[PDB]
Amino acid sequence: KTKEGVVHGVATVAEKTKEQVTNVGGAVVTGVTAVAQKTVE
Amino acid sequence: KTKEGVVHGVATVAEKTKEQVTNVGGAVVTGVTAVAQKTVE
Amino acid sequence: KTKEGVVHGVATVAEKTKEQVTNVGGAVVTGVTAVAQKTVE
Amino acid sequence: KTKEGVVHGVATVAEKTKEQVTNVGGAVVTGVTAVAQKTVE
Amino acid sequence: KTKEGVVHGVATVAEKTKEQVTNVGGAVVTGVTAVAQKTVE
Amino acid sequence: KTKEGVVHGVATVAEKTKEQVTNVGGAVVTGVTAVAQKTVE
Amino acid sequence: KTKEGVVHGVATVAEKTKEQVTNVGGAVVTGVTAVAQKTVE
Amino acid sequence: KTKEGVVHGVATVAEKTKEQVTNVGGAVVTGVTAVAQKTVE
Amino acid sequence: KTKEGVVHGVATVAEKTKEQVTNVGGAVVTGVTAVAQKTVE
Amino acid sequence: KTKEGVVHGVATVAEKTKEQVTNVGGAVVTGVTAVAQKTVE
């Protein structure tokens, strides 16, 4: 009757975001949402 | 009657986003949503 | 009847964000939201 | 009938943020929201 | 009927923030919100 | 009879390099050699 | 009969380098060599 | 008959380097060699 | 017949370096060698 | 027949260095070698 891992609210808010990105090498990532929910029993 | 791994709310909000990206090498990724839910029993 | 790990509210707010990024090497990331919820029982 | 780890309110507020970033090496990150909720029972 | 770890209010407020960042080496991070809630039972 | 921009020696040496890389999102780059020689007259 | 910008020796030496890299989001880069030789006349 | 910018010796030596890197967000870079030789006349 | 900027010897030596790095947010960089030789005439 | 800026010897020696680094936010850098030789004439 238990619950081990719960995630229910996380916010990430931007507004009117203009930008320029210029690297030499490496990898450009704009948005990120990722889950690696390694639950071992 | 248990629950081990639950994810129910994660937000990622942008608005009016203009940009320019120019790398030399590497890989451009704009949006990201990814799940690697390695659940071993 | 227990709950071990709960996350329910986290805010990250910006507004009217103009920028320029120029590295030589390395990797540019603009937004970040990530969960690695390693729950082992 | 217990609760071990709860996070419910964390604020991060900016406004009208203009900037320029120029490194030589290293990796530029603009926004950060991240959870590593290692709950072991 | 107990609660071990609770976080409910933390503020981080800026306003009208213009800046310039120029390192040689190292990694620029603008916003930070992060949780590493290592709760072991 | 002049020379404006000359690059003649830069070394990058590794040896016996074993590794493992596992991201969730983003782009893996192993070797990097890159030139963006923006010479404007 | 002049020379404006010359680079002739820079070393970067490692040996017997074993490692493991595991991010959640962001981009892994192992080696870096990069030139952005913006010479304007 | 002049020389404005010369770089001829810079060392970076490691040996027998074992490591592990685990971030949540952000970008891992192992080796770095980079030149941004902005020479304006 | 002059020389304005010369760099000829800089050492950075380590030996038998084992480590572990674990951040939550931010970017891990292991080695650093970088030149930003802004020579304006 | 002059020389304005010369750097010829700088040492940085470690030995048998084992460590562990664990931040929450911010960016880990292990080795550092960097030159920003802003020579203006």
From Swiss-Prot, chains A, B, C, D, E, F, G, H, I, J:
Q: Which disease is it linked to?
A: Genetic alterations of SNCA resulting in aberrant polymerization into fibrils, are associated with several neurodegenerative diseases (synucleinopathies). SNCA fibrillar aggregates represent the major non A-beta component of Alzheimer disease amyloid plaque, and a major component of Lewy body inclusions. They are also found within Lewy body (LB)-like intraneuronal inclusions, glial inclusions and axonal spheroids in neurodegeneration with brain iron accumulation type 1. Parkinson disease 1, autosomal dominant: A complex neurodegenerative disorder characterized by bradykinesia, resting tremor, muscular rigidity and postural instability. Additional features are characteristic postural abnormalities, dysautonomia, dystonic cramps, and dementia. The pathology of Parkinson disease involves the loss of dopaminergic neurons in the substantia nigra and the presence of Lewy bodies (intraneuronal accumulations of aggregated proteins), in surviving neurons in various areas of the brain.
Stretches forming sequence repeats: 1-14, 15-25
Name assigned to this protein: Alpha-synuclein
Record comment regarding domains: The 'non A-beta component of Alzheimer disease amyloid plaque' domain (NAC domain) is involved in fibrils formation. The middle hydrophobic region forms the core of the filaments. The C-terminus may regulate aggregation and determine the diameter of the filaments.
What is known about its subunit structure? Soluble monomer. Homotetramer. A dynamic intracellular population of tetramers and monomers coexists normally and the tetramer plays an essential role in maintaining homeostasis. Interacts with UCHL1. Interacts with phospholipase D and histones. Interacts (via N-terminus) with synphilin-1/SNCAIP; this interaction promotes formation of SNCA inclusions in the cytoplasm. Interacts with CALM1. Interacts with STXBP1; this interaction controls SNCA self-replicating aggregation. Interacts with SNARE components VAMP2 and SNAP25; these interactions allows SNARE complex assembly and integrity.
The gene is SNCA
Which stretch of the full-length chain is present here?
43 to 83 of 140
Name the domain of life this protein comes from.
Eukaryota
Q: Which effect does the record note for changing residue 4 to K?
A: In PARK1 and DLB; significant increase in binding to negatively charged phospholipid liposomes; increases oligomerization
Instruction: Identify the tissues in which this protein is expressed.
Output: Highly expressed in presynaptic terminals in the central nervous system. Expressed principally in brain.
| Role this protein plays | Neuronal protein that plays several roles in synaptic activity such as regulation of synaptic vesicle trafficking and subsequent neurotransmitter release. Participates as a monomer in synaptic vesicle exocytosis by enhancing vesicle priming, fusion and dilation of exocytotic fusion pores. Mechanistically, acts by increasing local Ca(2+) release from microdomains which is essential for the enhancement of ATP-induced exocytosis.
From what organism does this protein derive?
Answer: Homo sapiens
